[PDB]
């Protein structure tokens, strides 16, 4: 089978990730944060999903992915999908920073999908550093010209997602694209082209996220090239 490895960082919504993969007929394998290389060295892994978690990614004792195992995925060209804590784990893993959000988020939230030609859809640019304009705001970040592959076939440039986080990525990891933002989360979703790394601050596995299943289809089939 074309295995999709789902790593557990303690999420209360963890099994929903397995549900999402079941809905699109995808064989999944569940391991924990401390997964060792010998346990997955001989698996047919096409992609890796890092689940959410209630712990603080900067606090001591919190669940982390072994540097050895993370770099194994990159070297083996295995795409990574980070969710909530999983996204923040990616940032910490690749020279990014994570602080406590000035305004935390919970419940249904609209997220703006970012391209270079749709930044003026951000009508809340002064929420972040009191930026004069949207153009001025995203001059500090790198944006794609085409819609990110993860959001392929999403109708609008706005998606309704389920939020649940007190921390946020404040410094984007090395050479990442900024591909989404919300009113209370500037760096809401990231993308690295050379390593095929995708991160989302919200929970696409929760059914409150209307386009969550579409994202799981894109990552599994279009990005990881899995067979049914």
- The DSSP code for 206 is S
Q: What resolution in angstroms does the PDB record give?
A: 2.6
CA torsion, ordered 164, 168, 172, 174, to nearest 10 deg: -80
| CA nearest neighbour of 192 among 132, 134, 130, 149 | 149
In the chain, the domains with their CATH numbers are 1-228 (3.40.50.880)
Residues 6+ apart with CB under 8 A from 84: 11, 51, 52, 53, 164, 165, 200, 201, 202, 203
Spatial distance between the Cα atoms of 188 and 28, rounded to a whole number of angstroms:
26
DSSP alpha helices (H): ranges in 34-158? 37-40, 67-75, 85-93, 134-137
Spatial distance between the Cα atoms of 216 and 49, rounded to a whole number of angstroms:
10
Spatial distance between the Cα atoms of 80 and 89, rounded to a whole number of angstroms:
11
Spatial distance between the Cα atoms of 91 and 165, rounded to a whole number of angstroms:
15
- The DSSP code for 211 is T
Q: Is 88 annotated as a binding residue?
A: yes
Structure tokens at 100: 């406590």
- Known catalytic residues are 84, 203, 205
Sign of CA dihedral 50, 55, 57, 63: negative
**Kind of pairing, strands 3-8 and 185-192?**
unpaired
User: Coil, strand or helix: which one is 208?
Assistant: coil
CA torsion, ordered 99, 104, 109, 114, to nearest 10 deg: -30
Q: Is 164 annotated as a binding residue?
A: yes
Q: Is 203 annotated as a binding residue?
A: yes
Q: How many helices (H) and strands (E) does the chain have?
A: 6, 9
């Amino acid at each position: 089978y074309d295995k999709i490895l789902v790593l557990n960082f303690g999420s209360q919504y963890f099994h929903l990730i397995v549900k999402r993969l079941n809905n699109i007929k995808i064989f999944s394998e569940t391991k924990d944060y401390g997964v060792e290389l010998k346990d997955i060295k001989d698996m047919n892994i096409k992609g890796v999903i890092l689940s959410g978690g209630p712990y603080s990614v900067t606090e001591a004792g919190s669940p982390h992915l072994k540097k050895e195992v993370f770099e194994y995925f990159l070297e083996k060209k295995i795409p990574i999908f980070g969710i909530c804590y999983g996204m923040q784990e990616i940032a910490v893993q690749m020279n990014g920073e994570v602080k406590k959000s000035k305004t935390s988020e919970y419940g249904c939230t609209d997220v703006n999908i970012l391209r270079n030609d749709n930044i003026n859809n951000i009508t809340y640019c002064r929420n972040f550093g009191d930026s004069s304009s949207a153009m001025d705001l995203y001059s500090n970040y790198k944006l794609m010209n085409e819609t990110c592959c993860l959001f392929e076939n999403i109708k609008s440039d706005i998606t309704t997602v389920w939020m649940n986080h007190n921390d946020e990525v404040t410094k984007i990891p090395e050479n990442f694209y900024l591909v989404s933002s919300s009113e209370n989360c500037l760096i809401c979703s990231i993308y690295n082209k050379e390593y095929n790394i995708y991160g989302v601050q919200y929970h696409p596995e929760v059914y409150e996220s209307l386009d969550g299943e579409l994202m799981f289809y894109n990552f599994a089939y279009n990005i990881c090239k899995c067979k049914k």
